[PDB]
RNA sequence: AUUGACAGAUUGAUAGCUCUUUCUUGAUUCUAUGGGUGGUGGUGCAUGGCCGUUCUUAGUUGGUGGAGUGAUUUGUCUG
């Protein structure tokens, strides 16, 4: 392809595990939210639990830091529920803060 | 998936071992099959290495030659 359609997810989650700042699980993502820690978060397009889907959005609504979407609840983490405490991020960064 | 543990229970025990309960741990481990791993388990009558004893004594081999069909002997001897 001509450039790369959303490899800003897969490039960063490989290379961030040099420094080790990826966080996994409902407890630990919630603890990463309830903290001075989490910088970007994710959820499934469709997971289950209206509250569960809502809670992720709701927790973010307090202290900021958005979600996006991605695809398939099995194939979220396999590029590495996600938390993350240039080059790859240039596609994401302009989408997150600005429009 | 596994872990740390207060105050009671229970226990000699301020070992959360296991609990009546309910907070936490974050892929190190658990679950089973194969296979490893470890032991002051057994065998010194499977062995190594070391020590004692035969032996505190003076003794012990093979080379060539001689004797004997041979085991062996002579050398290693009467004094």
PDB file of C-alpha atoms (C1' of nucleotides) in Angstrom, chain B:
ATOM      1  C1'   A B   1      -3.989 -18.437  36.028  1.00  0.00           C
ATOM      2  C1'   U B   2      -1.210 -18.239  40.743  1.00  0.00           C
ATOM      3  C1'   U B   3       0.204 -14.795  45.140  1.00  0.00           C
ATOM      4  C1'   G B   4       0.447 -11.034  49.990  1.00  0.00           C
ATOM      5  C1'   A B   5      -2.909 -10.534  54.419  1.00  0.00           C
ATOM      6  C1'   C B   6      -5.451  -7.606  58.878  1.00  0.00           C
ATOM      7  C1'   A B   7      -9.167  -8.958  63.414  1.00  0.00           C
ATOM      8  C1'   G B   8     -11.749 -13.413  64.875  1.00  0.00           C
ATOM      9  C1'   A B   9     -12.119 -19.011  63.768  1.00  0.00           C
ATOM     10  C1'   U B  10      -8.544 -23.022  64.192  1.00  0.00           C
ATOM     11  C1'   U B  11      -3.786 -24.128  65.641  1.00  0.00           C
ATOM     12  C1'   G B  12       2.009 -24.824  70.378  1.00  0.00           C
ATOM     13  C1'   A B  13       2.540 -20.943  66.662  1.00  0.00           C
ATOM     14  C1'   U B  14       2.375 -12.707  65.458  1.00  0.00           C
ATOM     15  C1'   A B  15       2.919 -20.410  59.707  1.00  0.00           C
ATOM     16  C1'   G B  16      -3.463 -16.740  55.765  1.00  0.00           C
ATOM     17  C1'   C B  17      -1.515 -23.411  56.398  1.00  0.00           C
ATOM     18  C1'   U B  18      -6.797 -24.213  55.983  1.00  0.00           C
ATOM     19  C1'   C B  19     -10.720 -21.061  56.707  1.00  0.00           C
ATOM     20  C1'   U B  20     -17.184 -18.178  58.132  1.00  0.00           C
ATOM     21  C1'   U B  21     -16.507 -13.836  55.078  1.00  0.00           C
ATOM     22  C1'   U B  22     -14.069  -9.997  51.085  1.00  0.00           C
ATOM     23  C1'   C B  23     -10.152  -6.818  49.540  1.00  0.00           C
ATOM     24  C1'   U B  24      -5.877  -7.764  46.618  1.00  0.00           C
ATOM     25  C1'   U B  25      -1.931 -10.344  42.927  1.00  0.00           C
ATOM     26  C1'   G B  26      -1.275  -9.420  37.544  1.00  0.00           C
ATOM     27  C1'   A B  27       0.703 -14.343  33.269  1.00  0.00           C
ATOM     28  C1'   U B  28       6.376 -15.224  37.038  1.00  0.00           C
ATOM     29  C1'   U B  29       2.668 -19.877  37.610  1.00  0.00           C
ATOM     30  C1'   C B  30      -1.210 -23.227  37.869  1.00  0.00           C
ATOM     31  C1'   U B  31      -3.798 -28.549  35.255  1.00  0.00           C
ATOM     32  C1'   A B  32      -2.410 -33.153  33.235  1.00  0.00           C
ATOM     33  C1'   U B  33       0.698 -36.287  30.566  1.00  0.00           C
ATOM     34  C1'   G B  34       5.898 -37.501  29.446  1.00  0.00           C
ATOM     35  C1'   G B  35      10.646 -36.408  31.744  1.00  0.00           C
ATOM     36  C1'   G B  36      13.780 -34.436  34.944  1.00  0.00           C
ATOM     37  C1'   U B  37      15.504 -33.099  39.995  1.00  0.00           C
ATOM     38  C1'   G B  38      17.180 -34.411  45.012  1.00  0.00           C
ATOM     39  C1'   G B  39      18.648 -37.452  49.269  1.00  0.00           C
ATOM     40  C1'   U B  40      23.366 -38.803  55.748  1.00  0.00           C
ATOM     41  C1'   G B  41      17.556 -43.729  51.182  1.00  0.00           C
ATOM     42  C1'   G B  42      19.770 -49.297  49.986  1.00  0.00           C
ATOM     43  C1'   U B  43      24.403 -51.780  47.866  1.00  0.00           C
ATOM     44  C1'   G B  44      31.615 -50.793  49.729  1.00  0.00           C
ATOM     45  C1'   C B  45      29.825 -58.649  47.406  1.00  0.00           C
ATOM     46  C1'   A B  46      29.032 -53.278  41.043  1.00  0.00           C
ATOM     47  C1'   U B  47      33.349 -49.473  41.543  1.00  0.00           C
ATOM     48  C1'   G B  48      36.902 -44.834  41.863  1.00  0.00           C
ATOM     49  C1'   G B  49      39.977 -42.153  45.381  1.00  0.00           C
ATOM     50  C1'   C B  50      42.033 -42.563  50.259  1.00  0.00           C
ATOM     51  C1'   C B  51      43.570 -45.145  54.630  1.00  0.00           C
ATOM     52  C1'   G B  52      44.758 -49.527  57.557  1.00  0.00           C
ATOM     53  C1'   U B  53      46.708 -54.429  57.598  1.00  0.00           C
ATOM     54  C1'   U B  54      49.619 -58.532  55.668  1.00  0.00           C
ATOM     55  C1'   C B  55      55.047 -56.090  56.909  1.00  0.00           C
ATOM     56  C1'   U B  56      59.051 -52.454  60.108  1.00  0.00           C
ATOM     57  C1'   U B  57      60.193 -56.944  57.897  1.00  0.00           C
ATOM     58  C1'   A B  58      63.804 -57.331  53.547  1.00  0.00           C
ATOM     59  C1'   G B  59      61.858 -58.446  49.877  1.00  0.00           C
ATOM     60  C1'   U B  60      60.086 -58.357  44.276  1.00  0.00           C
ATOM     61  C1'   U B  61      60.233 -58.505  38.645  1.00  0.00           C
ATOM     62  C1'   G B  62      61.208 -59.120  33.603  1.00  0.00           C
ATOM     63  C1'   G B  63      65.652 -59.198  28.955  1.00  0.00           C
ATOM     64  C1'   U B  64      69.051 -62.840  26.548  1.00  0.00           C
ATOM     65  C1'   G B  65      71.463 -67.648  27.759  1.00  0.00           C
ATOM     66  C1'   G B  66      71.407 -72.680  30.465  1.00  0.00           C
ATOM     67  C1'   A B  67      68.027 -77.156  32.656  1.00  0.00           C
ATOM     68  C1'   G B  68      62.953 -79.511  31.936  1.00  0.00           C
ATOM     69  C1'   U B  69      57.877 -82.779  27.251  1.00  0.00           C
ATOM     70  C1'   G B  70      55.710 -79.301  30.920  1.00  0.00           C
ATOM     71  C1'   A B  71      53.779 -76.487  35.462  1.00  0.00           C
ATOM     72  C1'   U B  72      58.301 -74.241  36.736  1.00  0.00           C
ATOM     73  C1'   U B  73      63.299 -73.249  37.548  1.00  0.00           C
ATOM     74  C1'   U B  74      68.248 -70.887  37.401  1.00  0.00           C
ATOM     75  C1'   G B  75      70.068 -65.753  38.134  1.00  0.00           C
ATOM     76  C1'   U B  76      67.686 -64.421  43.549  1.00  0.00           C
ATOM     77  C1'   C B  77      73.858 -69.135  46.018  1.00  0.00           C
ATOM     78  C1'   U B  78      77.694 -73.569  50.029  1.00  0.00           C
ATOM     79  C1'   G B  79      80.217 -70.001  53.378  1.00  0.00           C
TER      80        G B  79
END
